[PDB]
Write a protein that binds this DNA or RNA. Structure first.
Ligand code: SA3
Length: 565
DNA sequence: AAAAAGACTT
DNA sequence: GGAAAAATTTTT
DNA sequence: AAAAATTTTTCCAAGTCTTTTT
């Protein structure tokens, strides 16, 4: 049938749903104990571990081939949380982690992973079918007259935290979520889910002000984790559309604001002069608005409104250009932003006033935060917040670059290269850097020998064409004229295959150190892509995959070739 | 306000 | 949503 | 067949921003 929610009357602000019914969450598979043959050693003597401690042991044993299991924090934190999980007799023997031997456990787990790849077709088909019924019983929920798919109905299995970068809590045990940790959300008129036999849920609420189905607190940072609906849903979609419409509401007066902060660099007060240079960095240079986070709980990473004096270095003339600012800091997910950038005169002179009488450990932009920045952005435009500047700047840049890289005479695969090249341009700006895959980028040798193999085929096609024109000299008739037709059609068809493999090769080389993914899903308006695909006749299925085609369903229907962001 | 929470992004 | 796995696929 | 490159689920957190409590 297919529900077109985008044609319906917008949902009144306040309420998110009227009805909500779901079979609750699926719990993480229980611990399957280690057999009599797999032994844990301590001080070279055998030790049978109690089911609680043996479970945490398995969590360290599996990551043993990694490099972080030698880090001080990972080992301190781990051993702390492991000592808790032990019995009073084990706490007395096991004084340190360094005298423990996990090798037999680690080998068993490297053996089971290997034994799972050698599993028979009859067995694999049995797991894949009982996995697809789990998806039909717990995978969907009812939300207002329609069935909507759930995002992550499965609850996270217990293991060890690593997080990203230099984390202070890395190594800590993520404890198993029991039904008693779960808060349920459904309507009054709905069938409240039944908890696992001989268990009870923490609290069953009916909050129609919220979009979640199940929620709970996780022990590492204490933040609330949620079971939300799949992107194809109304609730996640109507909001994603709204986002991209508030990026357009910025476009019609962006130049007005971009020519306001410029004059504010010459302002009277210090607070007004800081807020303006901050806004410049977010807009033109693409920085996330740095929210102040607690120290010693998360990694030391910053953003704009949280940048420190040590993070930026000033240089007058570097390699030929005036007023250069050198950025060197770890952003979200510990990803480094290195940027040497020629700015205006009044900016470079302003940064000196901010770094005046301050130490390297102090915050560059004092008398400012994200809330002080956002209050001004609300009085500049309704709904405007600091992240709309990444959405706008990304979406507009995708449109400008497509209007430049799409040649009307190009064939279909070459047009795709253009969209990727334009996607790439947005990935570099919005800082979605990546590290080259370990030993997998050497398979570039195997992709080039597919292009050099097609040249071997064309070096026989061009020399097959030369036997069509050299035989036209001796006896020219209707049978010899067909050899100049059939052996010219082949040269053109093998040449369009070499072009296709040279197009798809330039993609992988230039897109080595960046990622299109984040931008594609969360920053680029899909209507810009659909308009493009309808304009050049390129089928959408060649740009958007199975998942994204369902997420952006609203853009695939409602959007003509004439859409202008 | 000004932390501390809770809800959605990315 | 990127990085690692697993369910598929193309080269061997 | 059986090693190997490409493709799609399943692991794992870290931000932005609004809403409570203190
Ligand atoms: O960029 C990301 N880095 C991440 O580590 C990440 C990201 C995204 C993400 C980026 C763009 C986007 O559009 C959606 C997205 N969902 C993410 C992550 C996670 C993520 C990480 C750990 C985890 O346990 C659940 C997660 N979900 C998930 O996102 C939500 C977290 O509450 C849930 O819907 C569910 O856990 C699962 O989908």
């Amino acid at each position: 049938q297919k529900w077109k929610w985008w044609e319906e009357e917008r949902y009144p602000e306040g309420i998110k749903w009227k009805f909500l019914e779901h079979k609750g969450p699926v719990f993480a598979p229980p611990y399957e104990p280690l057999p009599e043959n797999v032994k844990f050693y301590y001080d070279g003597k055998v030790m049978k571990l109690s089911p609680k401690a043996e479970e945490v042991a398995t969590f360290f044993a599996k990551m043993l081939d990694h490099e972080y299991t030698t880090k001080e924090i990972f080992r301190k934190n781990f051993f702390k949380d492991w000592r808790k999980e032990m019995t009073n007799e084990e706490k007395n023997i096991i004084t340190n982690l360094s005298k423990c031997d996990f090798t037999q456990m680690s080998q068993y787990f490297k053996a089971q992973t290997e034994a799972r790849k050698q599993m028979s077709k009859e067995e694999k088909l049995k797991i894949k079918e009982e996995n697809e019924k789990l998806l039909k019983e717990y995978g969907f929920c009812i939300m207002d007259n329609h069935k909507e798919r759930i995002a992550n109905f499965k609850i996270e299995p217990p293991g060890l935290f690593r997080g990203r970068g230099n984390h202070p809590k890395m190594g800590m045990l993520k404890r198993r979520i029991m039904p008693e940790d779960i808060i349920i959300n459904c309507s009054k008129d709905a069938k409240v889910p039944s908890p696992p036999p001989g268990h009870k849920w923490k609290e069953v609420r009916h909050d129609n002000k919220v979009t979640w189905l199940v929620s709970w607190t996780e022990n590492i940072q204490g933040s609330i984790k949620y079971i939300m609906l799949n992107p194809s849903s109304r609730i996640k979609g109507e909001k994603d559309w709204q986002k991209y419409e508030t990026a357009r509401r910025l476009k019609k007066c962006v130049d007005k604001i971009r020519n306001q902060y410029r004059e504010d660099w010459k302002s009277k007060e210090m607070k007004v002069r800081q807020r303006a240079v901050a806004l410049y960095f977010i807009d033109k240079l693409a920085l996330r608005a740095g929210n102040e986070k607690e120290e010693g709980e998360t990694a030391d990473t910053v953003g704009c409104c949280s940048l420190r004096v040590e993070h930026i270095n000033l240089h007058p003339e570097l390699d030929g250009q005036e007023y250069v600012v050198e950025f060197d800091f770890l952003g979200k997910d510990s990803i480094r932003y290195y940027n040497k950038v020629p700015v205006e005169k009044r900016v470079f002179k302003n940064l000196q006033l901010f770094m005046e009488n301050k130490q390297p450990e102090d915050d560059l932009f004092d008398r400012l935060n994200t809330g002080i920045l956002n209050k001004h952005l609300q009085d500049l435009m309704e709904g405007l917040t600091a992240k709309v500047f990444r959405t706008y700047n990304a979406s507009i840049t995708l449109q400008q670059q497509l209007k430049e890289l799409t040649a009307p005479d190009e064939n279909i695969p070459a047009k795709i290269l253009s969209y990727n090249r334009a996607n790439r341009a947005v990935a570099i700006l919005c800082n979605h850097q990546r590290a080259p895959p370990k030993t997998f980028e050497k398979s570039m040798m195997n992709l080039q020998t597919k292009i050099d193999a097609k040249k071997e085929q064309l070096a026989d096609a061009r020399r097959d064409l030369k036997s069509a024109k050299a035989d036209a000299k001796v006896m020219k008739d209707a049978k010899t004229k067909k050899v100049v037709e059939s052996k010219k059609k082949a040269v053109q068809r093998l040449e369009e295959q070499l072009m296709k493999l040279e197009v798809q090769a330039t993609d992988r080389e230039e897109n080595k150190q960046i990622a299109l993914g984040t931008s594609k899903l969360s920053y680029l308006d899909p209507r810009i892509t659909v308009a493009w695909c309808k304009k050049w006749g390129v089928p959408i299925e060649k740009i958007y995959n199975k998942t994204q085609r369902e997420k952006f369903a609203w853009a695939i229907d409602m959007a003509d070739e004439d859409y202008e962001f």
